[PDB]
Amino acid sequence: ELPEDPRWELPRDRLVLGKPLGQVVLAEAIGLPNRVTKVAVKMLKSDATEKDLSDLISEMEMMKMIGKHKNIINLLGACTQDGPLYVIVEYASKGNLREYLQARRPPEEQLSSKDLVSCAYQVARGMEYLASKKCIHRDLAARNVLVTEDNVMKIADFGLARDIHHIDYYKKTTNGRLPVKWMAPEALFDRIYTHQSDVWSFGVLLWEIFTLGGSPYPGVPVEELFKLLKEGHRMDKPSNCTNELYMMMRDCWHAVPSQRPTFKQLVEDLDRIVALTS
Amino acid sequence: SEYELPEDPRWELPRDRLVLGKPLGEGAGQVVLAEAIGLPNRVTKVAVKMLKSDATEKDLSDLISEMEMMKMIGKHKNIINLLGACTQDGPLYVIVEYASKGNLREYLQARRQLSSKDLVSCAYQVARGMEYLASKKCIHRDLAARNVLVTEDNVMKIADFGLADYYKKGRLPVKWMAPEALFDRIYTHQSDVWSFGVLLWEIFTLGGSPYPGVPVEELFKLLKEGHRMDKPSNCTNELYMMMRDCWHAVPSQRPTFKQLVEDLDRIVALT
Ligand SMILES: Cc1cc(Nc2nc(NCCc3cccnc3)ncc2Br)[nH]n1
Numbered sequence: 001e002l003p004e005d006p007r008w009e010l011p012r013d014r015l016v017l018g019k020p021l022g023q024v025v026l027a028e029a030i031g032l033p034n035r036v037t038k039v040a041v042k043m044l045k046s047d048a049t050e051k052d053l054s055d056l057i058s059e060m061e062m063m064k065m066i067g068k069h070k071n072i073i074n075l076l077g078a079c080t081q082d083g084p085l086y087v088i089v090e091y092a093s094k095g096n097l098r099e100y101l102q103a104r105r106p107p108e109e110q111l112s113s114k115d116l117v118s119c120a121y122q123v124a125r126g127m128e129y130l131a132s133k134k135c136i137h138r139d140l141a142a143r144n145v146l147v148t149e150d151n152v153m154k155i156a157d158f159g160l161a162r163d164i165h166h167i168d169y170y171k172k173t174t175n176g177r178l179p180v181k182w183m184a185p186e187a188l189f190d191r192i193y194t195h196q197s198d199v200w201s202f203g204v205l206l207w208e209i210f211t212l213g214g215s216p217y218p219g220v221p222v223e224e225l226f227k228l229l230k231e232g233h234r235m236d237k238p239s240n241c242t243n244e245l246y247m248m249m250r251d252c253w254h255a256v257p258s259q260r261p262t263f264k265q266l267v268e269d270l271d272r273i274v275a276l277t278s
Numbered sequence: 279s280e281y282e283l284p285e286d287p288r289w290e291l292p293r294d295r296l297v298l299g300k301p302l303g304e305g306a307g308q309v310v311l312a313e314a315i316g317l318p319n320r321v322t323k324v325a326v327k328m329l330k331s332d333a334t335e336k337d338l339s340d341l342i343s344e345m346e347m348m349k350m351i352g353k354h355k356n357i358i359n360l361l362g363a364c365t366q367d368g369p370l371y372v373i374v375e376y377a378s379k380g381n382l383r384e385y386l387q388a389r390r391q392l393s394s395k396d397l398v399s400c401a402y403q404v405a406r407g408m409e410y411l412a413s414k415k416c417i418h419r420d421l422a423a424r425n426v427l428v429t430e431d432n433v434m435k436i437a438d439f440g441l442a443d444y445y446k447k448g449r450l451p452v453k454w455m456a457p458e459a460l461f462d463r464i465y466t467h468q469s470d471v472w473s474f475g476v477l478l479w480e481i482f483t484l485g486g487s488p489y490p491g492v493p494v495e496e497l498f499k500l501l502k503e504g505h506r507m508d509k510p511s512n513c514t515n516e517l518y519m520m521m522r523d524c525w526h527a528v529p530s531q532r533p534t535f536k537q538l539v540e541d542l543d544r545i546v547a548l549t
C-alpha cells in the first residue's frame with residue numbers, strides 16, 4: 001503493498017482497538033495530542049480476498065476526494081503500513097437511524113415533529129453535499145444513516161464499491177427487509193443511477209422517518225414489488241405526517257426523474273418546514 | 279327440488295307482478311334489477327337473485343337455503359332484506375332489497391364527499407347490522423366493504439349474510455380473516471369482529487386495499503409475526519385502537535358487536 005500517504009496516516013500505536021460494532025470495530029485514537037477520541041475502524045476479515053482489500057481501499061480513496069461535512073461519516077485517518085489496513089472514520093454512538101427511531105416510539109425520550117422534520121433536513125443536507133461532490137449513493141436508506149451522541153445525522157456507505165451489474169435483488173438486509181424497496185424504478189429495471197434515483201430513495205427515507213422506522217411494503221416480495229411499481233403504486237401517507245410532507249415524498253417519487261426535486265430544493269423546503277414545525 | 283319447490287304463501291309473488299331488468303352482477307348465481315308490484319299497485323325497485331342457466335341441483339339448493347336463512351333471520355334496517363320470492367312454475371327468484379349506490383368500497387372510493395361523522399356513522403350502521411345478525415345466530419365469514427351495499431338514501435346494508443380456496447381473487451379475501459379462522463378453521467361471531475376491524479380500516483382509508491402486493495404465503499407470515507396494519511391518516515387514535523382491539527390475537531379479548539355499537543354510538547355523537 002500500500003502506498004504511504006501522510007495526509008491521513010496514523011501510527012499503529014496511536015489506536016487502541018475495542019469492542020466490535022458489527023468488520024467495524026469501536027476504537028480509541030490517541031492524538032489525531034494527549035487526548036483520545038472514540039472512533040470506528042473499518043478492517044478486513046481473515047476470510048478476505050484481494051477484491052475486498054480493493055474495495056476497502058477504493059472506499060477510503062473516495063472518502064479522501066469527497067472531503068468533510070457535518071452530515072456524512074467523515075474519514076479521520078488510516079493505518080496503511082506494516083499491517084492490516086485500518087480505515088478510521090467518525091463514530092456514531094446511537095446506531096442507524098432506523099434503530100434510533102424505532103427505539104423512540106411510544107410504548108426512549110420521544111421525538112417531536114420538529115425532531116423528525118429536523119432529521120430529514122440533516123440527511124437532505126448530507127445528500128446535497130455528496131451530490132455537489134459528484135457522488136451518487138445508490139443505497140440511501142435509514143439504515144445507512146447514523147446518529148451521533150449529539151443526535152447528528154451522518155450518511156454512511158456513500159463511498160462504497162458495488163458492481164451494480166451484480167446486485168442480488170432477492171437478498172435481505174440483516175434485519176429481513178429487501179434493498180430493492182428503496183430503488184427508483186429506472187435504477188431497478190434499467191440500472192440507471194443518478195442524483196434523481198437517490199432522491200426517489202430519499203422519498204422512502206422520509207417515509208421511514210415519519211412512520212418512526214416503518215418497513216416499506218411489508219410482506220411484499222420482489223416480483224410483486226415490480227408489479228406495484230409498473231402500476232404506478234405509491235405508499236400511503238403515514239399518520240402524524242402533514243400533507244405538505246406527504247407531497248414531498250410523492251414529489252420525490254415522481255415517475256419522471258427530471259420532475260423530481262433536487263436535494264438543493266429539498267434542503268430549502270426542509271429548512272422552511274423545520275422552522276415552522278412544532 | 280327437481281320438479282317443484284315447496285310452496286310458502288307468506289312470501290310468494292306472482293310472476294306477472296315482477297318485471298325483470300338490467301343485470302346487476304354475475305357470480306359462481308346471477309343478480310338482476312327488477313320492478314316488483316304489490317309487496318298494492320305500487321312499483322318497488324328490487325334486486326332479484328337467481329341461478330344462471332348452468333346451475334346444478336346443489337347450486338339451487340344453496341340458493342334455497344340462503345332464502346330460508348333470510349326468513350329465519352328476520353328484518354333489520356342495516357341488512358339486505360328478503361321481500362319475496364317466485365318459487366313455483368319456473369325459475370327461482372329471491373327478491374331482496376335494491377341498494378342503488380353499490381358496495382361500500384366503490385362508494386367510498388367514488389367520494390375521496392364524506393365528513394368524519396359520515397364515515398363513523400357508516401361504521402356504526404355496519405356494526406348494528408352485525409349485532410342484529412349475531413343476535414340471530416348468523417356468522418357472515420366474509421364481512422368486508424365489498425359485501426356492504428349502500429342505498430339511494432345512503433343506508434348501509436350487510437349483504438351475503440345468508441350464504442351457504444385462499445387464492446381466488448382483484449384482491450384476496452384471506453386478508454379479512456381472523457387468524458383462528460384462517461389457521462384453525464374456527465368461525466365465530468368474534469372472527470367476524472376481526473373482519474369488522476379490517477372493514478373499519480377500509481372505511482377510514484376510503485376504499486383502501488389492505489396489504490397491497492402481499493400474496494397469500496407472505497400474509498400467513500405476517501399474521502404469525504403479530505403484524506398489524508398502521509393507523510391510517512385521518513383516523514383518530516381511538517378509532518385506530520378499535521381496529522387494534524378487533525385485531526387481538528385472542529378472540530375473547532376482542533370487543534363484541536354489542537360493545538362496538540355502544541362505542542361507535544358514543545364516537546358518532548362526538549365527531
Ligand atoms: C462507521 C460507524 C459505525 C458507528 N456506530 C455503530 N456501528 C455499528 N455497525 C455498523 C456497521 C457499518 C459498517 C459500515 C458502515 N456503516 C455501518 N453498530 C453500532 C454502532 Br453505535 N459509528 N461509525
Ligand SMILES: Cc1cc(Nc2nc(NCCc3cccnc3)ncc2Br)[nH]n1
Binds near residue numbers: 325376427
Ligand atoms: C342484492 C342487491 C344488489 C344491489 N345492487 C347492486 N348489486 C351489484 N351486484 C350485486 C351482487 C352482490 C354484491 C354484494 C354482495 N352480494 C351480492 N352491483 C351493483 C349494484 Br347497485 N342491490 N341489492
